[PDB]
């Protein structure tokens, strides 16, 4: 009788449910969502100009046949404002749901920057379905982006928005594109692949003030600079959600702390998808995702698991110069060989054995990706 109750219906909590239901299919279900419920692919919000799709055309199945596919209730539009860990329940607003076991499946959220002016809040933040919808809408007959944020989801996006016919202007503080996950090198033959699209950076300002001027903004930057657009996106980054963790007495770090079999530092709750940092691992993609699913879904089936993450690399969704790469096991490194010429770069990374732990690959070089994968070593040991 008492339900499994997972928040989230991303494709965490959605590929869990499938997963789980393989091994279980007399066990009450009961999935809460803040969104509309739909079933889609995130990843493909970043493809829908080239492909010519809007939000419904992403879309896979709406609510009432996932709940049919899953024999679940989904509670769509519901916010979840409570964990009680103590007495095995969550809370949404003044209702209470008890729990067998809760599944935190409950994603990021943007990474917000400060702005002044009297358009402030039009900035369209686009991490999920209706956000897309909501900014497709509003993008409609117009021509000028601003974009904020130069990882690996702003850079995606420019090139997207590009190819559907917007002039871009990508404004973010830091010193290269993609920070962090990116050889200086390949940064630089990524960015020049979309500058090439006629994309301009603005690399080292910030966005000081948007403003209202005739029928569309002006935006204000840091440094002087004042860019004329119709829109804004706010793609600055993500941070998984951890505040009603925190306040429910969960370990915390950058995610929500889980060990190798998805449980959180509590009895009967466990986390798994961009909210959760997984034996120290935090990783906003799908792959990893999907191994978590697969392992949870057994520990909630009486079958206690683990995972045990292999080779898992980005490949970044920028057909103006296609990018994969697969940056090195923490706790691992070796030397830097740039190869190759131009855009079409090799950047292999080799342990003091000689091996391959790591790589960026540019332009044509991409083709080498399946060989490459051969060498790497898995993310966990
Ligand atoms: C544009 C972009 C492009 C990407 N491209 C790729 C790619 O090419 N390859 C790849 O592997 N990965 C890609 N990713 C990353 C990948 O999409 C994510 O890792 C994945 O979708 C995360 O799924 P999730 O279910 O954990 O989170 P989410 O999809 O964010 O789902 C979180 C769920 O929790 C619900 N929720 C949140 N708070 C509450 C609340 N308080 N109460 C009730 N419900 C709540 C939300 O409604 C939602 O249903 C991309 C991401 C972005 C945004
Ligand atoms: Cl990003
Ligand atoms: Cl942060």
């Not at 709940?67 to 916010?79: P, S, V």
């Not at 969550?90 to 008890?98: K, L, Q």
């Not at 690996?152 to 594109?177: H, K, M, R, T």
């Not at 683990?306 to 030397?335: F, H, I, N, W």
Request: glycine share 12%.
């Amino acid at each position: 009788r008492a339900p499994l109750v997972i928040i989230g219906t991303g494709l965490a909590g959605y590929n869990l449910a499938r997963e789980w239901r393989k091994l279980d299919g007399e066990t009450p279900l009961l999935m809460i969502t803040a969104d509309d419920g739909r079933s889609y692919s995130k990843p493909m919000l970043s493809t829908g100009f080239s492909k010519n799709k809007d939000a419904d055309g992403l879309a896979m199945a709406e609510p009432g046949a996932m709940a049919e596919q899953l024999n679940a209730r989904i509670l769509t539009h519901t916010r979840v404002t409570g964990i009680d860990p103590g007495h095995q329940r969550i809370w949404i607003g003044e209702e209470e749901v008890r729990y067998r076991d809760l599944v935190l499946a409950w994603g990021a959220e943007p990474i917000r920057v400060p702005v002044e002016g009297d358009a402030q809040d039009a900035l369209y933040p686009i991490n999920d379905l209706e956000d897309y919808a909501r900014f497709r809408q509003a993008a409609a007959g117009k021509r000028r982006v601003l974009l904020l944020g130069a990882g690996l989801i702003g850079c995606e996006f420019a090139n997207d928005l590009s190819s559907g016919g917007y002039q871009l202007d990508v404004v973010a503080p830091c010193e290269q594109v993609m920070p962090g996950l990116l050889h200086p090198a390949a940064a630089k033959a990524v960015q020049a692949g979309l500058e090439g699209l006629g994309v301009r950076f603005h690399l080292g300002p910030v966005l000081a003030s948007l403003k209202k001027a005739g029928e569309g903004l002006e935006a204000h930057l840091s440094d002087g600079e004042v860019i004329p657009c119709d829109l804004v996106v706010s793609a600055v980054g993500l941070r998984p959600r951890t505040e009603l963790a925190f306040a429910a007495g969960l370990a915390v770090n950058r995610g929500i702390v889980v060990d190798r079999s998805l449980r959180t530092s509590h009895a009967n709750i466990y986390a798994l998808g961009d909210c959760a940092e997984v034996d120290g691992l935090n990783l906003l993609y799908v792959m990893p995702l999907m191994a978590c699913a697969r392992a949870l879904a057994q520990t909630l089936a009486g079958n206690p698991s683990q995972v045990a993450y292999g080779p898992m690399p980005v490949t970044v969704k920028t057909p103006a110069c296609p990018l994969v790469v697969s940056p090195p096991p923490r706790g691992m490194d070796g030397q830097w060989l740039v190869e190759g010429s131009g855009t079409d770069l090799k950047v292999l990374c080799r342990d003091t054995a000689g091996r391959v732990i790591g790589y960026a690959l540019t332009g044509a070089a991409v083709n080498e990706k399946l060989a490459l994968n051969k060498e790497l070593p898995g993310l966990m040991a």
